[PDB]
Design a protein around this ligand. Structure first.
Ligand SMILES: C[C@@H](O)CN1CCN(CC(=O)O)CCN(CC(=O)O)CCN(CC(=O)O)CC1
Ligand SMILES: C[C@@H](O)CN1CCN(CC(=O)O)CCN(CC(=O)O)CCN(CC(=O)O)CC1
Ligand SMILES: [Cl-]
Ligand SMILES: [Cl-]
Ligand SMILES: [Cl-]
Ligand SMILES: [Gd]
Ligand code: NA
Length: 128
């Protein structure tokens, strides 16, 4: 699924993501745009052999199981494929654990380089 901007904001906000660990709703929509292009099916291979999955490109090294990342952890206790769903529940619960773990939204390289220190409220401007 390719989400529109307001549509993803109202989904994220209904799944509790808004001001989660003090990160405003504009920070999450910002990250999703630059991680996946709002596209739930997005995948990218990393050079160590793991893969990033879904709208927030969640890494198979620590967080989910795809059966091809040897001696890796599955801390969200899900298959990688679950994070490719049009229903963003799996991805959201999975991003709550990651952003809680000590490093915040710096886990998202696209968030750090393109949204941190900018006008993030611009990403929800106009939405009801
Ligand atoms: C709502 C309009 O913006 C729709 N839009 C009209 C064309 N725009 C003109 C403009 O953005 O004023 C120029 C191109 N546009 C640049 C950008 O938006 O950054 C990228 C494509 N956009 C993506 C999007 O906007 O979500 C869809 C088409
Ligand atoms: C031509 C305009 O599209 C210029 N545009 C600024 C104004 N946009 C317009 C809008 O989308 O209504 C609103 C703010 N915007 C939210 C979003 O667009 O998704 C984030 C910043 N954008 C990033 C991008 O375009 O990728 C910078 C370029
Ligand atoms: Cl915001
Ligand atoms: Cl594996
Ligand atoms: Cl923080
Ligand atoms: Gd824009
Ligand atoms: Na894994």
């Amino acid at each position: 699924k390719v989400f529109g901007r307001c549509e993803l904001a109202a989904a994220m906000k209904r799944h509790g993501l808004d001001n989660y660990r003090g990160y405003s709703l504009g920070n999450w929509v910002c990250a999703a745009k630059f991680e996946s292009n709002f596209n739930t099916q997005a995948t990218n291979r990393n050079t160590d052999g793991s893969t990033d999955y879904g709208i927030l490109q969640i890494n198979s090294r620590w967080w989910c199981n795809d059966g091809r990342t040897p001696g890796s952890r599955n801390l969200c206790n899900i298959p990688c494929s679950a994070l490719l769903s049009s229903d963003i529940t799996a991805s959201v619960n999975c991003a709550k654990k990651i952003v809680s773990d000590g490093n915040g939204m710096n886990a998202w390289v696209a968030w750090r380089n393109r949204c941190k220190g900018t006008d993030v409220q611009a990403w929800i401007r106009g939405c009801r």
